[PDB]
Design a protein around this ligand. Sequence first.
Ligand code: 4W5
Length: 315
Amino acid sequence: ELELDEQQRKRLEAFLTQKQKVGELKDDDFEKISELGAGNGGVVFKVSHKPSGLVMARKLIHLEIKPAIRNQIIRELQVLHECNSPYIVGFYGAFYSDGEISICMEHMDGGSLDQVLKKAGRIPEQILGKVSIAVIKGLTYLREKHKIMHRDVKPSNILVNSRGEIKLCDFGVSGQLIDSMANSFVGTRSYMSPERLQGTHYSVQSDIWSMGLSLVEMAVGRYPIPPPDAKELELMFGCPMAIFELLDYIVNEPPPKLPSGVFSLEFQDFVNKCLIKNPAERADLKQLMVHAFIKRSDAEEVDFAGWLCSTIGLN
Ligand SMILES: CCOC(=O)c1ccc2n[nH]cc2c1
């Protein structure tokens, strides 16, 4: 079902051309522009690769490890050079330098949806349609051309840009990078399915739960767990829990849902099918890829770039 258009083939072609113009990467080739902040590993800076004049994002994961460890990581991250999706963030290269592991990737001027969320208050449902399509197409590609799941779907990992593109970032490609990162950062488990917080069976089904929950959070403008009272719903529309306690609530108590009336029933059904605690009953990608919400969303011509630029004040 993975089919492209002319505008998408055109953009994918240009990126490859830009990428080929860049040779081997070295600390001394990079000039810092600004900071895009932490960061599921370490820090993220918007940088300029001086020789090529390109603008990239550079992830600095400070790990004072031996030359054996780092070289194995780079070898695994080299797989991403084969990666060609309009739904996955572009990769330029990886390398070690005096303390840190640098990962260079395509710059996204919209930044993360966690950032877009803070500004917007709450993201409108028609916009979440486009996002849902994009996350689905992304995860579908990750399973196909790269036979690996994302393992980390959260608003902070969905990246957007002024051309209206939506792409995925910080998905486990290097097994040894995660291994040495046992200390070190450790990504938030608040978006993990109630089966991953039980260690039991985890496929693309955990990615779908993570998506549904990201979607709920963006729609209401708050992390959904624990469900707020109708008094916080009057405050919101009109129409302090610790991490270990929160994770115990996920596995034990009923899943979050969108408030009634405010949202459309297709969209409530969509998220409901993503947040079914049992993975066997939870919707798979094929099912989701043809759900009424997705069909309707694909058929709407939603001006995403327009909305975005106005919301984050681009320019
Ligand atoms: C998840 C860690 O990556 C980031 O925080 C991030 C932010 C903005 C970006 N633009 N292009 C790539 C980016 C990566």
